[PDB]
Amino acid sequence: IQQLPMMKGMGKDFKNADYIDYLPVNMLATPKEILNSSGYLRSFPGITKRYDMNGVSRGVEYNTAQNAVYRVCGGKLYKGESEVGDVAGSGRVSMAHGRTSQAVGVNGQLVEYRYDGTVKTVSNWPADSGFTQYELGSVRDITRLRGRYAWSKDGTDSWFITDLEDESHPDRYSAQYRAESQPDGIIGIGTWRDFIVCFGSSTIEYFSLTGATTAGAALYVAQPSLMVQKGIAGTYCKTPFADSYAFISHPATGAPSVYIIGSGQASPIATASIEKIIRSYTAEEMATGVMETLRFDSHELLIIHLPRHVLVYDASSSQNGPQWCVLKTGLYDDVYRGVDFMYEGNQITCGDKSEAVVGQLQFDISSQYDKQQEHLLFTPLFKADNARCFDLEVESSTGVAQYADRLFLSATTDGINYGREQMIEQNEPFVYDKRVLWKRVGRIRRLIGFKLRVITKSPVTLSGCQIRLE
Amino acid sequence: IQQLPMMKGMGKDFKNADYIDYLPVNMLATPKEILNSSGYLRSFPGITKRYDMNGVSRGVEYNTAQNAVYRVCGGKLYKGESEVGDVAGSGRVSMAHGRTSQAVGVNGQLVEYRYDGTVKTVSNWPADSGFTQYELGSVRDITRLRGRYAWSKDGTDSWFITDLEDESHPDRYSAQYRAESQPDGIIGIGTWRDFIVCFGSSTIEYFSLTGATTAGAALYVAQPSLMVQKGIAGTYCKTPFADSYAFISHPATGAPSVYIIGSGQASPIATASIEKIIRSYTAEEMATGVMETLRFDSHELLIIHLPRHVLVYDASSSQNGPQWCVLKTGLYDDVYRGVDFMYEGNQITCGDKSEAVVGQLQFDISSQYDKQQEHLLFTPLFKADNARCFDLEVESSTGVAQYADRLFLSATTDGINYGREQMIEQNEPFVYDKRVLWKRVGRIRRLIGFKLRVITKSPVTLSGCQIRLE
Amino acid sequence: IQQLPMMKGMGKDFKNADYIDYLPVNMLATPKEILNSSGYLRSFPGITKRYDMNGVSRGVEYNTAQNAVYRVCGGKLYKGESEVGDVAGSGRVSMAHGRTSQAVGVNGQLVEYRYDGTVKTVSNWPADSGFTQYELGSVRDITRLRGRYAWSKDGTDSWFITDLEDESHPDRYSAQYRAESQPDGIIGIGTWRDFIVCFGSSTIEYFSLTGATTAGAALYVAQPSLMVQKGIAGTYCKTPFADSYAFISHPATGAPSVYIIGSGQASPIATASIEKIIRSYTAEEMATGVMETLRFDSHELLIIHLPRHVLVYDASSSQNGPQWCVLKTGLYDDVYRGVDFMYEGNQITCGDKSEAVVGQLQFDISSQYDKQQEHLLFTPLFKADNARCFDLEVESSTGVAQYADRLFLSATTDGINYGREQMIEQNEPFVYDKRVLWKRVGRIRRLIGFKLRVITKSPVTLSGCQIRLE
Amino acid sequence: IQQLPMMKGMGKDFKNADYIDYLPVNMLATPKEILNSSGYLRSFPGITKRYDMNGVSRGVEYNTAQNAVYRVCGGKLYKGESEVGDVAGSGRVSMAHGRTSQAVGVNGQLVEYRYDGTVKTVSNWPADSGFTQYELGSVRDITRLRGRYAWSKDGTDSWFITDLEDESHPDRYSAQYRAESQPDGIIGIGTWRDFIVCFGSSTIEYFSLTGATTAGAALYVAQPSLMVQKGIAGTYCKTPFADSYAFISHPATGAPSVYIIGSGQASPIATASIEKIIRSYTAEEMATGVMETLRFDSHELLIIHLPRHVLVYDASSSQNGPQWCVLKTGLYDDVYRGVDFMYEGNQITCGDKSEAVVGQLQFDISSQYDKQQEHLLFTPLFKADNARCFDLEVESSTGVAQYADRLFLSATTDGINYGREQMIEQNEPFVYDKRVLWKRVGRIRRLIGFKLRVITKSPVTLSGCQIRLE
């Protein structure tokens, strides 16, 4: 009796005869110390329609000052279900809320909405007042530390600041700040534990405020002990993850790869196969990749929305090596649906990247809206000669289905292309005890590996595959 | 011969066919290196009525200046047994004693009683005196560091302080301080090792006093090295535990979960099943969750009084993984009775949440007041095929009972619903040596798990369940 | 059944009968947890022509201010494909970009190329201005920290600096800095985390800038806690590797050897056989050795372009001891083709040293341009007496070839010279499953070692050699 | 089958019946993971004459300012092969180069030569100038930090310094510095990472320069955290090694022994037998012991030139315990030939101590000049009763010899005096595969130990001695 792990499956690709492992499609990994194994695999939760909105999502941020979720969701702003304002422009926006403003920052101007009901835009002080009158530019990203905002001019080292008393003007005396570590544009900006993180193309630098008590004297001073020496590939390739940012490396460095910021250095978390997938996209296509973080139950996910891949990293389940996963909607290869996830109340609300709708995650159903989904599992290739496998017994938990869904399994002799697909039912609507197995698998000549296609709209749980090897 | 652990039992739920473990209800876990196993399970101590009071318990605090226990317990304040004052308002109060006051802080005002016999209320300085005249608001929580009080204005960043010479006024010159790292109202306040801990909705900030020796010059300065970056779900979800506060995460963060503050970060202490239970409550219903701490013998408990669950965490018994427990009063599902545990003299004085009475814990009886209690134990599911179990022999300690109570045991084949209940007596009033066992259990087809219902009003001790597997 | 590792093979040389190991020629090492072994060996990617340029490569640098790759590549400068200026001089050049000019620094003068379209040169301030008028000399290397350049004069301790406003003049008041623990010329200069690293002949010293706010008062102050106490052999024997520089030791110390800078000391990374190869060159020949860093997939390679050796160090694959490799072009011994590797877009663009052409790396082809290449693998010597080896079966992955290429294997009895070469086909153009093995190897008298010559222009993968020893 | 190590052999001496181990004379130890054992033993490289010089070697120092090796070598100074100056006096000199001088420091005055062609001597400032006019004394050792020299007055605590502008005078205002922790003369001086190390008879002190910017105000201040509390036995018994100096303890401390300086303390590196050898010399005779450092291939050797012993310590090969070795020239007991080893170009240039000649090391020959050499190996004593050893087979590498040299082996029964010498040829001029073994060794009564005399002028390699024990 041998046990075949399915938490990650090895294989090879026909393009250049290289060994690349097949990530488990559309199913997560949980360690739970199951009956005879250690850990069970559960399908991703299913999406159900909640509200109808103007368009495809373009941004989200959980306002802390007011207990509500803000999202532009296409044509115009939304607070939960309410309308509360209009935003102009198509693309993706970066939001940073405030005590008395929202600061959507669409297009190249720092548009900030007010809780009173008025709309304002950040611009230079009036010439009649008699202030410094800086030279502002286009805006890319937004943040907020203490009581003021901070944006970065497009394609230039300098990033500006926001005044305290009047929040719609740069400042009275001192607002011009520069990175100056290496010559590089500011790809993005962010905040981390009272530090203003400056995401450059090649470097990352931390700024800490100091007590000036003087007119125009260096409110923020750059800290050089915490430099990372690596950049970010795109504007939105950064998230708050664990206590770090977990960016994606820029093409300026050796090669694009996922990372995680340490104390003063970046530690990789992406396997070679993941970087092989990342390298498939050109430089321009890489810059349009969104990143997020999601935490439900004991999981801590890190989702990367690449143009054709929705790779997902599970931090808790990566006990021995990284655990990556890929998500897709259609039966064939397609991009996942639902871009911005955010925890509202006691539910998780997702957006949508193609349809003008918003939906919530549901745990007892595995269908996105009202369409069935494909789930895949891959067993790593094994080299056994002249053996005969008979009892392949995967163990499932059943009883939350609406139809007796079936399972397709197949075997590879060369590791690239599969044989016939055998049809076994793996779920029954109200049977809580049943056995899923295949009685005869036959001789294996040189090497064999398995596949476990499942097409359902009900939760799928599989844990522990064993075969009687002789 | 196989030994079956009972400290925690695995299972699955019928709603979504997920593997959730069954916590052992109403009995603690103690490691003591027993005859043949390591650890024994003992029932929770039973409540007995001590005094009759005005109403349902609403607060408790062990006054240190005077060796006595204060509790409002409904209609009016109480010091031990005496009346000593009246408090108005229904709900829950936050209590913080003083050298010359008690500061119940009911409703939205800091009502503070005096040992002399007079009642005062914190209010602005008289306009005739000529002081700074702050603008106070509603009060949520109270604390005391050095000779000063500290309260937080409701729904706003700012938290105030109390003057030294006249402790019924904010201060002479400098009393308004604010959090400000992020825009978030102060959910709660507390003290920890000369630091005034500021519990925000999204962040946690530590304030340390400095020597001013000046008129209105920053008595307290915020320390930014000790930020936690996580909020608290409700007003009363915090409790000094060990050397930290052990809060509950806010919905603003990815998902609600229990935590413990470290040096500068929070470390989770809740299993996935515990967070699944916590997510069952809506956001508004979660804010009414009280937490406490209790320490008797070698135990160190952390009790969470959710609306429908009384989850208990045992710090000392969590050698390999967390050890959570749930308490309930009725034979069916119900919430535990007795809110506030405080150690007075050599006894523990529990409150009440459904009747106008106060009671003390007793160790040699397992009945709350004069009613019997239910105790359950779940054995984790095992996968053995075609085997037969014969001798299931749990080992109990007897001789402190009033009647020969019986024990109900049953088995599951699918892990959800149980079979027939077999009745075995597990205790005899004055017999110190007897066996508790069942001679035949029969074949197990695929998998089996057990249950050990006990209904007594006498102490229940069980340690070590073994079955002759073949 | 025994398994023979091929990642590194031991042997001896006929010159002085010493045990020197044979590094795997032109094949990398990757740990991947292959079917029955741990790791597989894959050929280096092949070069394909991309552009036609003026001459052999002479320098490269990835401009960060403008997203493009700059390379002189012979007669005149190039930005990607465009001409954009002319450069004078033959040899090797040191490049350091800027935020207004490029800078090439040929001969002994800092020729800089401004983007506007003009060319400038660093020279003393005009005498009419009235400044300090330093005494400049011949330049060796260039770098840039903050908004200013920094160069070192030829054969002297002192290294100068560049003015802020005008970057074509040394400075207004303070530009003379000198190294000077020990009397040594500055072989090279470089930057590392806001420190201007001064590479001397015998020591390495770190300079950190300080806030002057004064006329000519010590802009840069030397830090003595970070001195390394070892020099660099040549001008270009330094790269940014990991977080350190990984130089080559100077003959001033005991013997030349590769190193890596630590916190305050150098840690060797070269085996004894590598230092034997390094010592083969005279002092003058070693000074013309280039070094680089390249990172594709999970690799982190350090390439040394010695006059007759192209040694490569793979950091990721060196789990147990250093993993060195050597590359060569012709069927006989010859130096590798392709000087400078840089990552542009999503491809890697290699230079050249014998032709006026530039090329890009391709992964599915193993031929440089359109000529076949040699790959070698050596098995370490084993001492087995009177045994008989029969089933020598190496495991390849096939199906991406253009012709049924064959493999040559042979055995040594004395460890110096090889026996007959047996031809076995190891790859078929479109067959994905086949066995590569030899059925009879015969008796071994005292000791034996194998060889796996392959000549292909298609990817070569071999992983795991097993022989039936009896 | 048993394997007998030869890296170090145990025995006893007839003088006092104490167990002393026999160090392997004239052959090094290298760990390389050989066919069946871990490590092989290779003979020391042979000396060959390169140049003819004036007389016996007296000093050496690798000038860094000019890429050339300086050595007095008896009658008059030498730069490489050129004459370039004359030095008077017989004995040993302490050499410390400079940016514009060489500072041989012979006899009692700091004789310093100049690159221009003139000779100067350190002496007091002229009385007409009007300076502080110190009282200099005899000089023992020389060093150089920054632009200053530093010498020590003979028999006194004080050590002086050298002026910057005119380096042939003590200083303008402040040059008198002193040790003073304990009353002890300065035996020697040295530099280490910007610290002027002061080697006393009983203590060691580190001096760090400070910014004076004042007339005669404490240029150097003594650091007391880095005291070692141990002296050095002789003037030249110290040497930069690794990152420390590795001195020899003074007779003032409990006993003479070798050491290595740590962070703030000395750690011994000498076995008991080595200290037994060191104690054989009287106090006066020990003061004439020279020490050096040499690094070729992976070795890092520390050579001590005692009057009758040439003990050598190998740092890299001391995996389990220290690895000491002894070198000798003649067939009988004699002192090694060649004092000063320095790495010039790609070769090592050894000195001489008995003839007026200088020579270079050569790796493929084992003869010093043109005379054969003796090599010994001792196997540690084993206690086996009534056993019989038959097949003693050492494994050698051959084929670089000029004649079929023979090997002498013998056995001890009491561990002091040896039996008959059996002659086996161990090398053949051009045979790369041969076996060296003895077929019968006979019964061993109580205990036995072996010996492996080899007399050749060709490289000797032996690795792995095994005997069939019964």
Side-chain angles (χ1 to χ4, degrees), chain A residues 12 15-18 155 157 180 183-184 227 229 254-256 264 275-276 279 381 383 413 416 446, chain C residues 33-35 40 42 62 64-65 97 99 146 193-194 243 295 297 343 363 395 397 400 432-433 435 461:
Chain A
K12 63 187 286 186
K15 297 296 289 183
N16 60 328
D18 204 345
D157 269 320
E180 273 179 300
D184 62 358
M227 201 195 288
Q229 262 167 309
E275 308 176 16
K276 287 215 201 94
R279 284 211 285 109
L381 275 192
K383 200 180 169 313
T413 295
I416 289 183
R446 212 168 72 95
Chain C
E33 172 86 50
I34 301 299
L35 294 175
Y40 69 97
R42 169 149 191 98
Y62 186 98
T64 303
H97 66 269
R99 199 155 186 85
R146 307 256 159 182
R193 192 188 289 272
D194 285 13
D243 186 74
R295 171 200 204 291
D297 293 18
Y343 188 90
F363 269 66
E395 169 162 328
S397 87
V400 191
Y432 295 100
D433 210 15
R435 302 175 75 94
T461 293

Side-chain angles (χ1 to χ4, degrees), chain D residues 291-356:
Chain D
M291 293 177 71
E292 291 156 69
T293 182
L294 181 62
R295 170 201 204 291
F296 62 83
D297 283 18
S298 183
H299 296 113
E300 284 158 23
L301 307 94
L302 167 79
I303 313 179
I304 297 170
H305 298 288
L306 291 151
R308 290 168 259 138
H309 287 101
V310 193
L311 299 172
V312 170
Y313 168 63
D314 191 350
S316 86
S317 161
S318 67
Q319 303 284 120
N320 50 288
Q323 177 68 17
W324 286 88
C325 176
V326 60
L327 277 54
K328 82 192 195 319
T329 58
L331 295 203
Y332 281 102
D333 191 0
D334 212 24
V335 65
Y336 188 65
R337 163 175 280 176
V339 170
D340 293 291
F341 305 103
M342 185 63 72
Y343 182 85
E344 183 179 1
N346 59 358
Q347 296 159 351
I348 297 171
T349 62
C350 77
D352 191 13
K353 68 169 68 180
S354 54
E355 201 190 285

